[PDB]
Amino acid sequence: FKIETTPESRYLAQIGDSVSLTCSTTGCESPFFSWRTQIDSPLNGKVTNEGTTSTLTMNPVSFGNEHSYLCTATCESRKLEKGIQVEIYSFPKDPEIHLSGPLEAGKPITVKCSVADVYPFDRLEIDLLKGDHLMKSQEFLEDADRKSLETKSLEVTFTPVIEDIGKVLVCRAKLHIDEMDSVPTVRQAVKELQVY
Numbered sequence: 001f002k003i004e005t006t007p008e009s010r011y012l013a014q015i016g017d018s019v020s021l022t023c024s025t026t027g028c029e030s031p032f033f034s035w036r037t038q039i040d041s042p043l044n045g046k047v048t049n050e051g052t053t054s055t056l057t058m059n060p061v062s063f064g065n066e067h068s069y070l071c072t073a074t075c076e077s078r079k080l081e082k083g084i085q086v087e088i089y090s091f092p093k094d095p096e097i098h099l100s101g102p103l104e105a106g107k108p109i110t111v112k113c114s115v116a117d118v119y120p121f122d123r124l125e126i127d128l129l130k131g132d133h134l135m136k137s138q139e140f141l142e143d144a145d146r147k148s149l150e151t152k153s154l155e156v157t158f159t160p161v162i163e164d165i166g167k168v169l170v171c172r173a174k175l176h177i178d179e180m181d182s183v184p185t186v187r188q189a190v191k192e193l194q195v196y
Contacts, residue, residue, distance in 0.1 A: 001027035018059035023071035063147035113171035114153030
């Protein structure tokens, strides 16, 4: 008598997706499945017991699904428990580069790169590069307040020069999470410098 789950022990889900957590048993004819969170709050998911397989489906995924779900299988007098830690994240769109004005050699200008609806932002890194030279890297220290989609930004000032003409301003946003293979961790925007 044993219990299995898929994923094995952790699932990285992007907010807005439909995710299914399955729980199976072997060695039991008619098991009784039961799900719950560590702290005991609404599952915010739909359970579907079929034979020896129970499926918890969260759709759409939200901040309410950010828990460690515990599947419990009872077979007559014996119980088995196995959890699956669900982590969520929001990284829907590319960054935006905003120039405070027109590019004029000798005249300082302010660049501002921003990324919208991001979670968790304490794992976000924004890099602004002129060509392949790093002008500035911005972090947002580990301390949110609550679960909310935010729009954070990087701001830097610099004086363009005749040599910057033709070079590209590249803003790279990196979300340092435990990636789900094909799941994006880096998004970027480019802007060609047209100095006058």
